[PDB]
């Protein structure tokens, strides 16, 4: 996270850390949507151009963390993956369209003050909150600049108009993506950065006071560049795939 601030304890209890077994290293963020399911960005797992393809055996999920590097005894819980599912139509060849993956925990995790699932938006929640100018929140242990925090970082960013998104880049943007970030004129900065991939973009419903995961940290051209914006997976649009995979 660039230009963020240290999170408060328990501020983002669905925050997950994807952690490589060997070498030991933070792979990406993720999110806890049930006691057995973790949501993240497919590119955290599979990115052929860079020779990346992680399997179940390669990783661990660390839940309930605050500190980036300490083993938080008695606080954090570490789980093994049973199965990874990548969207059948994730487009790694061109624009990371459909950048989404589900991970099934080997055993259900027990909830605590530090471990709690975020909600998945409904059509009307999406309708209502996913509007230009409205602010969401991103969290993660990623680089502080395009610079490794000691604790979880947070920043709040406004969703940006589609046309402004489209006109900031040469990449073909799809309906499965949304961008977020301040404008150069705006007098405020912030962005996700490397190590933040796969984390949650959340919003708090003014109707039911619940936190919903609207986005997944997806791609961006660098980190915190003027006139550029962070791109996020549009969770609601892929909600049917999610369901489908948890039902089946």
């Amino acid at each position: 996270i660039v230009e963020g601030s240290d999170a408060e304890i328990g501020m983002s209890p669905w925050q997950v850390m994807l952690f490589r077994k060997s070498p030991q290293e933070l792979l990406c963020g993720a999110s806890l949507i049930s006691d057995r399911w973790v949501l993240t960005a497919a590119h955290c797992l599979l990115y052929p151009p860079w020779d990346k393809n992680f399997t179940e055996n390669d990783l661990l999920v660390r839940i309930g963390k605050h500190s980036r590097t300490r083993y938080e005894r008695n606080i954090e819980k570490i789980s093994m993956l049973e199965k990874i599912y990548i969207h059948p139509r994730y487009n790694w060849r061109e624009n990371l369209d459909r950048d989404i993956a589900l991970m099934k925990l080997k055993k259900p995790v027990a909830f605590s003050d530090y471990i709690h699932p975020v909600c998945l938006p409904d059509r009307e929640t999406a309708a209502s909150l996913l509007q230009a100018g409205y602010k969401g929140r991103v969290t993660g242990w990623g680089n502080l600049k395009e610079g490794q925090p000691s604790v979880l970082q947070v920043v709040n960013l406004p969703i940006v108009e589609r046309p402004v998104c489209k006109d900031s880049t040469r990449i073909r943007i799809t309906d499965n993506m949304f961008c977020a970030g301040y404008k150069p004129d705006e007098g405020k900065r912030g962005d996700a950065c490397e190590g933040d991939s796969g984390g949650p973009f959340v919003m708090k419903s003014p109707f039911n006071n619940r936190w919903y995961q609207m986005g997944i940290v997806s791609w961006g051209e660098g980190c915190d560049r003027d006139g550029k914006y962070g791109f996020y997976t549009h969770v609601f649009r892929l909600k049917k795939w999610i369901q489908k995979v948890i039902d089946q």
Partner: peptide, 9 residues
């Protein structure tokens, strides 16, 4: 500089 995690994991 990651702190060593339990072998159990």
């Amino acid at each position: 500089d990651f702190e060593e995690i339990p072998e159990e994991y």
